[PDB]
Amino acid sequence: MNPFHELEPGPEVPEVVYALIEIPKGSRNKYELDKATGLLKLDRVLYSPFFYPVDYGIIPQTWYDDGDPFDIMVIMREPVYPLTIIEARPIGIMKMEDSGDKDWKVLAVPVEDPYFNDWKDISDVPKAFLDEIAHFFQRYKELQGKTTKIEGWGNAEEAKREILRAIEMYKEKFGKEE
Amino acid sequence: MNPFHELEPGPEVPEVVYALIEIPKGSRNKYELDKATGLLKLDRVLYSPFFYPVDYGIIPQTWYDDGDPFDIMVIMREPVYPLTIIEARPIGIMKMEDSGDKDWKVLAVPVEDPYFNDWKDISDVPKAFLDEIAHFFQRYKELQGKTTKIEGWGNAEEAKREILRAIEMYKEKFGKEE
Amino acid sequence: MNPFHELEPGPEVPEVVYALIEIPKGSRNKYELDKATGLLKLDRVLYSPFFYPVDYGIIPQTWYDDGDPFDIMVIMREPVYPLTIIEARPIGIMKMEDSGDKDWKVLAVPVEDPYFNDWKDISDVPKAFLDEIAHFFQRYKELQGKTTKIEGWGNAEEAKREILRAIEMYKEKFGKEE
Amino acid sequence: MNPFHELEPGPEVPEVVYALIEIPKGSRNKYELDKATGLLKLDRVLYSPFFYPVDYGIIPQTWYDDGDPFDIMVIMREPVYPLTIIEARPIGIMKMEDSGDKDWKVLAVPVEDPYFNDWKDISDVPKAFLDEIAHFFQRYKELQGKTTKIEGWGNAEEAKREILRAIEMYKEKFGKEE
Amino acid sequence: MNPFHELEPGPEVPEVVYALIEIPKGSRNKYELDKATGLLKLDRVLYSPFFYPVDYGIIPQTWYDDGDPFDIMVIMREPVYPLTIIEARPIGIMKMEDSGDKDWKVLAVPVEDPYFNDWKDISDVPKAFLDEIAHFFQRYKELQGKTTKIEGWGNAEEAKREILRAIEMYKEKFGKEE
Amino acid sequence: MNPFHELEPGPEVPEVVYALIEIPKGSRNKYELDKATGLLKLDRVLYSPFFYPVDYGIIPQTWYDDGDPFDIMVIMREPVYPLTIIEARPIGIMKMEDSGDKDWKVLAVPVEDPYFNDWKDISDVPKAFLDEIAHFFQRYKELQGKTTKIEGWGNAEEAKREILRAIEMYKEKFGKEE
Ligand SMILES: [Cl-]
Ligand SMILES: [Cl-]
Ligand SMILES: [Cl-]
Ligand SMILES: [Cl-]
Ligand SMILES: [Cl-]
Ligand SMILES: [Cl-]
Ligand SMILES: [Mg+2]
Ligand SMILES: [Mg+2]
Ligand SMILES: [Mg+2]
Ligand SMILES: [Mg+2]
Ligand SMILES: [Mg+2]
Ligand SMILES: [Mg+2]
Ligand SMILES: [Mg+2]
Ligand SMILES: [Mg+2]
Ligand SMILES: [Mg+2]
Ligand SMILES: [Mg+2]
Ligand SMILES: [Mg+2]
Ligand SMILES: [Mg+2]
Ligand SMILES: [Mg+2]
Ligand SMILES: [Mg+2]
Ligand SMILES: [Mg+2]
Ligand SMILES: [Mg+2]
Ligand SMILES: [Mg+2]
Ligand SMILES: [Mg+2]
Ligand SMILES: [Mg+2]
Ligand SMILES: [Mg+2]
Ligand SMILES: [Mg+2]
Ligand SMILES: [Mg+2]
Ligand SMILES: [Mg+2]
Ligand SMILES: [Mg+2]
């Protein structure tokens, strides 16, 4: 079953969502789910020797301003394999514009890693880690000649509100589309 | 096609079965196949810095007392990726109770690694390796507060008999269920 | 969707094809797509301590003389995961006979790694790298007692012509078959 | 120069010490510095499929009740190679008895990873992480038949006091010894 | 023996030098040789999720404007371990200022990897690879608040001339110093 | 201290020797100890996509017909780092001629991995594993144009006798040499 159309957004939306991981932490290959088929696809190789600082993917049954599912970043100690489902607790949101599109990204922790039990909001994350994530998104497209802008971070409530918006964007798109 | 409902238990049951691997040797992440969809899911992160000592997964079209497919452990030199099918020869069985449920696990070797050609029964395995596997299952849930009990090991015949039982448990469950 | 029947051979055949990777560079496990189901399967473990020198897989909706999809070798800096789709530019072809069957293999580079932007034909590849690939295929089955013969390399035009042949072999097989 | 006799305990003892790492996080091999020569030696392979949860090593020019240098555990995101020096800030201490010997171990963070800038005492560490470390030391020798006892954790002051003791134990031993 | 004072700069200076690697390609940890002792030391963890794109280290018995040995970058397919000696052929030089100091870095290939046999000058390197290296050095200190400037690349002759300068800087420093 | 001149051949020669590992299992880089300095050096990159099937190194204070220390192969489950000392039990010997020189290699197991407790002679090793090792040494230099010949395997007694010969070759060489 298609993990973008056929998985729900989460088991307890918006406090607990499913993250479908595309890119394990540590990868330079920018994988994306193929919308037509369900398979993992190489979108491109990053043009700089940078690596994704988080397990990176989508919330199923969401849509967003960049014409793709809403993006989620899960902090995993051991990275997962692509196309793994993680039950994830949103704790904040990175406010990014990407090539002119709103392209904000939920920051979340795995519900079922007790290391993160006390991580509940954006203030629980080491400041240098938030900075490292923002800096990656600030610079990783510089050699492609594409502009990104990072505004800062929102808290868990702002993240949850954005998840609800993205869920409605999917309904609107694929009530008529798929 | 669903690798739990749509793969057969094996090509020459019970002497050769299919193992659908969920967890590569060396992982601390406890992946499981999602029964509803077919996708890999993070069930939890082990609560201790322990790693699966075997490639760990299921026999398709089986069921078992813990309310999930029957568990199989494949000794792979190079671990496989999750959701890989391995043709596996049962050589023994670990007798485990897990949280009060019978939860025995086949020990098997890959048919198509010649390293293991002479591994045919539980006496062919290094004793310290059997001990390491049992000890993992004895201790890996201690910080979750869940009880496990390891009784010892059975031989290849006992493993094969248990495979036949698990195959019938699936028929009984999913002749009415799925 | 089945990535062998349900993916097209490519977006701009034969100059740009899809490669569906089975084996990441660096693996000793010989994975293959299961034709019946779509899942990754362990075909065998190489009998020697050799590793695939390329990301290795198939072109979807192709067939070939060895009774399987046409083989493609993609030069990836960071290997991909099995069952990843790569948009690939053919640059040459390895002329191999395998156990008596024609079993030539496209050599390609990822379109979306700028490292390879100037790799367009077989003369762009380091000679020692072509030699390493040929030598692997020359020797990797010696302990299985199976014969392989490597004739040399063809250029990108010869590769493209062979892709068109393999695409027609699939139509012929699965217009009546699947 | 010998990194046990010829490195000082630290640049600002006891608030900043040198950790000479023997074992990278994730290893099952229990490496130790060879006291006679300075080289890394395999002391043993852990008897269970457990891995060191921390970068593990010694403080130079220390001695301790188990007849070896005082042990230190450094929390590194990317593990270091054996025999690497890390400038480390003690934040707490694990109170362990090992085979009847006092064998407490400093817990420290790297001074020069900004991720850890706000980690200054034992209360800054996720509780589940302290539990995972203690559990490892509680169980990792069970198959060797050797007893360990973990009493709990002390704070950074208690750790610093123990570092000063271990430094004096070295002076006493190797004022007459080496 | 100290691999900075006791190794020569090379076997056929300046056409073939020794590179003493500190940092394997793919590392985020910035290791440096400890000048006082000879041991590997963690200088810092990069503040961004970037990795060294090359095997990175020093030419022995050199000195440079940043108060440390002259830097060399070796293109290794399989990264080496820290403190490994590589016989390296200079092919070009990255013109970098680092925090106000001249801090140029030789780009070299291993003499004894035949993959690189035809890499002899800066024009032999893929343009995107030179860009990736420069971009790393342009951005990797942005979160430390330290300025770097990359001027571009020089050819193999310019690299060789700079090696000869750095060799004389060591003689001048350590004819009086060490 | 130099781990070739300053380590003894073993603690209980010839039944237990020291192996000083140069090459971890899985490496394509052929590292060797530098005789002049003690440091690890890249001797060459293998010309084929083959990997060392064993942890590979030397017995200290030995010499041999190829003008270097006597070679030893240690079967490690988790490979060690270069320049690690392993206490090793010889179980057999590979009879190799390399470029015209006798170049036999001890096969050994780690004393302190209980997995190998019952491995005491060449008959204890899986036949396919001996074949894989021999095949590697048969083929790995084919692209260098250098001849190797593998005669077969000797048992543990023959290995032990060869260790005693190699120890005397060192005395003869470095009673006058070093
Ligand atoms: Cl992205
Ligand atoms: Cl389990
Ligand atoms: Cl193949
Ligand atoms: Cl320990
Ligand atoms: Cl640098
Ligand atoms: Cl060799
Ligand atoms: Mg995108
Ligand atoms: Mg996205
Ligand atoms: Mg975007
Ligand atoms: Mg997006
Ligand atoms: Mg379960
Ligand atoms: Mg299970
Ligand atoms: Mg269970
Ligand atoms: Mg179970
Ligand atoms: Mg095949
Ligand atoms: Mg094929
Ligand atoms: Mg073939
Ligand atoms: Mg084929
Ligand atoms: Mg000890
Ligand atoms: Mg210790
Ligand atoms: Mg101890
Ligand atoms: Mg101790
Ligand atoms: Mg520096
Ligand atoms: Mg430097
Ligand atoms: Mg600098
Ligand atoms: Mg510098
Ligand atoms: Mg040699
Ligand atoms: Mg040797
Ligand atoms: Mg040799
Ligand atoms: Mg030799």
DSSP letter string, D72-113: EEE--SSPPPTTEEEEEEEEEEEEEEETTEE--EEEEEETT-
CA torsion sign, D152 to D157 to D163 to D169? Answer: negative
Helices (H) and strands (E) in chain B, counts: 2, 9
Is B95 within 8 Å of B152 (Cβ atoms)? yes
Residue B110 makes CB contacts below 8 A (sequence gap 6+) with: B74, B75, B76, B86, B87, B88, B89, B116, C42, C45
Compute, in angstroms, the gap from residue E141 CA to the centroid of ligand 5.
9
Measured in degrees and rounded to the nearest 5, phi and psi for residue A135 equal -65, -40
CA-CA distance, C37 to C3, in Å (whole number)? 10
CA-CA distance, B116 to F128, in Å (whole number)? 8
Q: Which chains touch F (3 or more CB pairs under 8 A)?
A: B, C, D, E
Cis ω for the linkage preceding E14 (within 30 of 0): yes
What tokens does E72 get? 């060399």
Is C39 within 8 Å of C48 (Cβ atoms)? no
CA-CA distance, A133 to A92, in Å (whole number)? 13
- The three-state (H, E, C) secondary structure of chain E, written as one string: CCCCCCCCCCCECCCEEEEEEEECCCCCEEEEECCCCCCEEEEEECCCCECCCCEEEECCCCCCCCCCCCEEEECCCCCCCCCEEEEEEEEEEEEEEECCEECCEEEEEECCCHHHCCCCCHHHCCHHHHHHHHHHHHHCCHHHCCCEEEEEEEEHHHHHHHHHHHHHHHHHHHHHCC
CA-CA distance, A111 to A92, in Å (whole number)? 15
CA-CA distance, B8 to A110, in Å (whole number)? 33
Decide: helix, strand or coil at residue B104. coil
Q: Which residue shows structure tokens 């608040």?
A: E145
From chain D, the residues in CB contact with E37 under 8 A are 1, 3, 6-7
Would you tell me how many other CB atoms lie within 10 Å of the CB of residue F100?
Answer: 12
Alpha carbons within 13 A on the beta-carbon side of F30: 13
Compute, in angstroms, the gap from residue F43 CA to the centroid of ligand 27.
7
Let me know how long chain C is. Answer: 178
CA distance to partner chain D, nearest, from residue E105 (Å): 24
What tokens does B129 get? 């390796």
DSSP β-ladder status, A84-98 and B71-74: unpaired
CA-CA distance, D119 to E160, in Å (whole number)? 46
CA-CA distance, A96 to A101, in Å (whole number)? 8
Q: How far is CA A13 from CA A75, A153, A166, E32, in A?
A: 19, 21, 12, 48
Chains B and A touch (3+ CB pairs under 8 A): yes
Would you tell me how many other CB atoms lie within 10 Å of the CB of residue B60?
Answer: 25
Beta strands in chain A (DSSP E): 17-23, 29-33, 40-45, 55-58, 71-74, 84-98, 101-102, 105-110, 148-155
DSSP β-ladder status, F84-98 and F148-155: antiparallel
The whole-angstrom distance between residue D122's C-alpha and the CA centroid of its chain comes to: 15
DSSP β-ladder status, B40-45 and B71-74: unpaired
CA-CA distance, E2 to E87, in Å (whole number)? 17
- Please list the residues that pair with F23 across neighbouring strands: F56
CA-CA distance, E70 to E64, in Å (whole number)? 5
Decide: helix, strand or coil at residue B26. coil
Residue E175 makes CB contacts below 8 A (sequence gap 6+) with: none
Q: What is the dihedral of CA F1, F3, F7, F12, to 10 degrees?
A: 150
C141 → chain F, closest CA residue: F135
Q: How far is CA C162 from CA B118, C55, C72, C157, in A?
A: 42, 19, 11, 9
B8 → chain C, closest CA residue: C37
C135: nearest CB among F48, F132, F133? F48
The whole-angstrom distance between residue E79's C-alpha and the CA centroid of its chain comes to: 14
Residue F84 burial (C-beta neighbours within 10 Å; 0-12, 13-18, 19+): buried
Diameter over CA atoms, chain A: 43
CA-CA distance, C106 to C85, in Å (whole number)? 15
Question: Which amino acid appears at position B64 of this protein?
Answer: Y
From chain E, the residues in CB contact with F82 under 8 A are 81, 84
The whole-angstrom distance between residue D30's C-alpha and the CA centroid of its chain comes to: 13
The DSSP 8-state label assigned to residue A117 in this structure reads: T
Resolution of the experimentally solved model in angstroms? 1.0
Measured in degrees and rounded to the nearest 5, phi and psi for residue D147 equal -90, 135
CA torsion sign, E27 to A90 to A81 to B22? Answer: positive
Q: How far is CA A113 from CA A86, B28, B29, D24, D58, in A?
A: 10, 11, 9, 22, 30
Would you tell me how many other CB atoms lie within 10 Å of the CB of residue A5?
Answer: 13
DSSP β-ladder status, D148-155 and D84-98: antiparallel
Please tell me chain A's helix, strand, coil percentages from 3-state DSSP, rounded to the nearest 5. 25, 35, 40
- Please list the residues that pair with E30 across neighbouring strands: E44
Q: Which residue shows structure tokens 């199923």?
A: A60
Buried/exposed F138-170: b ≥16 CB within 10 Å, e otherwise: bbbbbbeeeebebeebbebebbbebbebbbebb
H-run or E-run covering F130: helix F127-139
Q: How far apart are the first and last CA of chain C?
A: 14
CA torsion sign, A163 to A167 to A170 to A172? Answer: negative
Q: How far is CA C82 from CA C42, C66, E22, in A?
A: 11, 21, 33
CA-CA distance, C106 to C90, in Å (whole number)? 6
Question: Which amino acid appears at position B129 of this protein?
Answer: F
DSSP A83-101: TEEEEEEEEEEEEEEETTE
D126: nearest CB among A118, A127, A128? A118
Diameter over CA atoms, chain B: 43
CA-CA distance, A77 to A116, in Å (whole number)? 10
Helices (H) and strands (E) in chain F, counts: 2, 9
What would you report as the CA-atom Rg of chain E, rounded to the nearest whole angstrom?
15
Buried/exposed B35-54: b ≥16 CB within 10 Å, e otherwise: eeebbbbbbbbbbbbbbbbb
Diameter over CA atoms, chain C: 43
What tokens does F44 get? 């060459």
Is B31 within 8 Å of A84 (Cβ atoms)? yes
CB-CB under 8 Å, D143 with B49: no
Residue A177 makes CB contacts below 8 A (sequence gap 6+) with: none
Would you tell me how many other CB atoms lie within 10 Å of the CB of residue C35?
Answer: 14
Is D129 within 8 Å of D145 (Cβ atoms)? no
**Residue (of C101, A50, A68) closest to E49 by Cα position:** A50
Cis ω for the linkage preceding D14 (within 30 of 0): yes
Q: Which residue shows structure tokens 């430094």?
A: D167
CA-CA distance, F57 to F18, in Å (whole number)? 10
CA-CA distance, C90 to C107, in Å (whole number)? 6
Decide: helix, strand or coil at residue C176. helix
CB-CB under 8 Å, B126 with F118: yes
DSSP β-ladder status, F71-74 and F55-58: antiparallel
CA-CA distance, B166 to B164, in Å (whole number)? 6
DSSP β-ladder status, C17-23 and C84-98: antiparallel
Alpha carbons within 13 A on the beta-carbon side of B113: 25
Q: How far is CA E18 from CA A21, E72, E151, in A?
A: 43, 9, 25
Would you tell me how many other CB atoms lie within 10 Å of the CB of residue F32?
Answer: 19
**Residue (of A163, A175, A174) closest to A16 by Cα position:** A163
Residue E149 makes CB contacts below 8 A (sequence gap 6+) with: E96, E97
CA distance to partner chain B, nearest, from residue A35 (Å): 16
**Residue (of E134, E165, E167) closest to E151 by Cα position:** E134
Q: Could you say which ligand is closest to the alpha carbon of residue A148?
A: 9
Decide: helix, strand or coil at residue A54. coil
Is C23 within 8 Å of C56 (Cβ atoms)? yes
Please check whether residue A27 touches B, CB under 8 A. Answer: no
Method: X-ray
Is D133 within 8 Å of D122 (Cβ atoms)? no
C-alpha angle D62-D63-D66 in degrees, rounded to nearest 5: 145
Residue D8 makes CB contacts below 8 A (sequence gap 6+) with: D18, D60, D61
CA-CA distance, C160 to C108, in Å (whole number)? 11
CA-CA distance, F93 to F102, in Å (whole number)? 12
Structural domain count, chain B: 1
CA distance to partner chain C, nearest, from residue F167 (Å): 30
Is C15 within 8 Å of C160 (Cβ atoms)? yes
CA-CA distance, E144 to E155, in Å (whole number)? 30
CATH number at residue E30: 3.90.80.10
Decide: helix, strand or coil at residue F118. coil
Decide: helix, strand or coil at residue F67. coil
CA-CA distance, A53 to A38, in Å (whole number)? 24
Residue B147 makes CB contacts below 8 A (sequence gap 6+) with: B97, B99, B100, B141
Q: Could you say which ligand is closest to the alpha carbon of residue C99?
A: 17
Let me know how long chain B is. Answer: 178
Chains C and E touch (3+ CB pairs under 8 A): yes
| Domain boundaries, position A122 | 1-178
**Residue (of F14, F28, F17, F158) closest to F94 by Cα position:** F158
Please check whether residue D63 touches A, CB under 8 A. Answer: no
Compute, in angstroms, the gap from residue E145 CA to the centroid of ligand 10.
29
CA distance to partner chain F, nearest, from residue B41 (Å): 28
Buried/exposed D78-117: b ≥16 CB within 10 Å, e otherwise: bbbbbbbbbbbbbbbbbbbbbeeeebbbbbbbbbbbbbbe
Residue C60 makes CB contacts below 8 A (sequence gap 6+) with: C3, C4, C5, C6, C7, C8, C9, C18, C20, C69
Cis ω for the linkage preceding F110 (within 30 of 0): no
Q: Which residue shows structure tokens 């590997």?
A: E40
CA-CA distance, A119 to A90, in Å (whole number)? 10
Long-range contacts formed by B67-72: CB under 8 A, 24+ apart: B67/B101, B68/B32, B68/B35, B69/B4, B69/B33, B69/B166, B69/B170, B70/B106, B70/B162, B70/B163, B70/B166, B70/B169, B71/B103, B71/B104, B71/B105, B71/B106, B72/B17, B72/B19, B72/B105, B72/B106, B72/B108
Is A139 within 8 Å of A48 (Cβ atoms)? yes
CA-CA distance, D65 to D43, in Å (whole number)? 18
CA-CA distance, F119 to F129, in Å (whole number)? 13
Question: Which amino acid appears at position F78 of this protein?
Answer: E
Please check whether residue D80 touches E, CB under 8 A. Answer: yes
The DSSP 8-state label assigned to residue C78 in this structure reads: S
